[PDB]
Design a protein around this ligand. Structure first.
Ligand code: CAC
Ligand code: CAC
Ligand code: ZN
Ligand code: ZN
Ligand code: ZN
Ligand code: ZN
Lengths: 331, 329
């Protein structure tokens, strides 16, 4: 109803405040942080870096982040709880599956996957008793048969619990349209779904058409940009070469079209990143030293400068995430 | 030098006894047992099944198993330590990588992989202080570029520590030849290497040639013969069409060639198996109700009746594993 799960327990949605709806503490792989912590220097070093970063985000006004790391992104909810408590920032944990499921997940049926997502929402993650407040799913442009199982299981878990679904897409492939079709074939309301990484495209017809159907639009890659780093193949492939201003103007664009209630904004940042080339984190941190504070420190003023009312910005950063995260469906 | 690391700490070579050199407590995926234990009923149920299975094997003469589950096979060394202590059977843990590395492993350099294998051997696995006593690697027929990195990292870790390397091969594609070539390019002695799943072929010339170069030959799929399951659409690509006796005779064949010193025998069994289709464990347990006791209860007597002397059988099951596992440079 009006309470959501965080890694410190249930909170009322009024307490969430300024919420970043797509972030990561650490982007990794199942088991990896605990098997090889010195990849990140140490577990302690990683935790301290996350606490420093989250504390700066809190100074800048952030009160909640949603960590959309799944099992196969190496989600360690014990780490999430430790850094949440120390930074005093709410963290919502995720269930679901991203793009790197191990065999023990890849070979499961839609029914089995449904019961796994329900366990993480209704019972707890691992043996921690920490419950997920969101379901994260990911597809390639053309959805694979396994990915379709994952989306149907996510829809079924969402209908049984009321918690929302948020996606990874290839926006240049208009990936959201095939995702939306599968979700609706399962009876899932578009108001329970955020189509993420949507600022990766400048195709406003695609974006507005999803928004008109009641989907939430995740403009969550705003600081991702390898401009100046064109000589870095791996960084360019990851971040793109569109400017952060270009990405942010899509926020204005969707407001101007009348869809401010459908916008969710985030940084998609992280404090460690093992599921890409070595030292990618140092490259990203040089691009955006603000980290997760990039949205409140850079983007919000940029948009106010362009004339967007304060009330509108507050609605996008506070009201929209609250409506989205509040469990809404079967009691 | 003459101490072997187990999940309960170091043991002397003489303590190892009858050793099964390729086994699994649970074939899974990294993080999976912790995240979804009810897939196996419960963690408790899996543990209890494994303790009964190990005690059965112990009553059939087994004293040590080598669990060749890697990180990406969901190795949980805390589970191994628990079941080892309750069954009074030594378990040697593994490092290395099998065929399901996640992105955080697949994108690593040979230098990075070498350091991870070294951490698990020299420092410990996770935060447990339990050190690996063997390095497990796997390839599919024609070695992929990443698999080649794994094999080279395994060779370098072995050379720094004396710990042996054991492999998963496609024997029908003669995959050991490519593995050996890579190991030798690194300066690794063949006597530190077991080429596994070798009973999956009838090509005796292929096996003898490897043995003559000094490789250990892992005849570890003996009970994966099934016989009777052609109605199944997932128990013929995992299990066999040749009888277990046929596989077992390869042991005798190699003995007769004068290579009994080169032979390692095991079951490649497990007590849980999530990295396959659902309910596979039920199929497997019905086909081989002996589990890890299949080697001592069926294969040893079969060889004895074919005229292999006790002393030779003890050499294969006690002496060879001890020489293989004892860290050596
Ligand atoms: C963990 As990601 C690079 O898919 O947002
Ligand atoms: C874990 As296996 C079936 O490759 O020996
Ligand atoms: Zn993503
Ligand atoms: Zn992300
Ligand atoms: Zn194998
Ligand atoms: Zn095996």
């Amino acid at each position: 109803g009006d309470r959501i799960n965080t890694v410190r327990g249930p909170i009322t949605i009024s307490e969430a405040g300024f919420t970043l709806t797509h972030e990561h503490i650490c982007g990794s792989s199942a088991g990896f942080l605990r098997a090889w912590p010195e990849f990140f220097g140490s577990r302690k070093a990683l935790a301290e870096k996350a606490v420093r970063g989250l504390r700066r985000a809190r100074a800048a006004g952030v009160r909640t982040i949603v960590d959309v790391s799944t099992f196969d992104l190496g989600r360690d909810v014990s780490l999430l709880a430790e850094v949440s408590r120390a930074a005093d920032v709410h963290i919502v944990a995720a269930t679901g599956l991203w793009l790197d499921p191990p065999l023990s997940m890849r070979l499961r049926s839609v029914e089995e996957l449904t019961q796994f997502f329900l366990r993480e929402i209704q019972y707890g993650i691992e043996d921690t008793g920490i419950r997920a407040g969101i379901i994260k799913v990911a597809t390639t442009g053309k959805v694979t048969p396994f990915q379709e199982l994952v989306l149907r299981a996510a829809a079924r878990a969402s209908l049984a619990t009321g918690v929302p679904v948020t996606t990874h897409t290839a926006a240049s492939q208009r990936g959201g349209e095939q995702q939306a079709a599968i979700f609706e074939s399962e009876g899932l309301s578009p108001s329970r779904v955020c189509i993420g990484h949507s600022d990766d495209t400048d195709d406003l017809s695609y974006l507005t058409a999803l928004a008109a159907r009641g989907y939430l639009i995740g403009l969550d890659h705003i600081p991702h940009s390898a401009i100046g780093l064109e000589d870095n193949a791996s960084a360019s492939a990851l971040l793109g070469i569109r400017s952060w201003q270009t990405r942010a103007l899509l926020i204005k664009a969707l407001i101007d079209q009348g869809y401010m209630k459908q916008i969710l904004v985030s940084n998609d940042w992280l404090f460690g990143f093992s599921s890409y080339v070595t030292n990618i984190m140092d490259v990203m941190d040089s691009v955006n030293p603000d980290g997760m504070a990039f949205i409140p420190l850079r983007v919000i003023p940029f948009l106010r400068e362009k004339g967007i009312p304060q009330e509108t910005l507050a609605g996008i950063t506070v009201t929209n995430p609250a409506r989205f995260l509040s469990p809404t469906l079967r009691a």
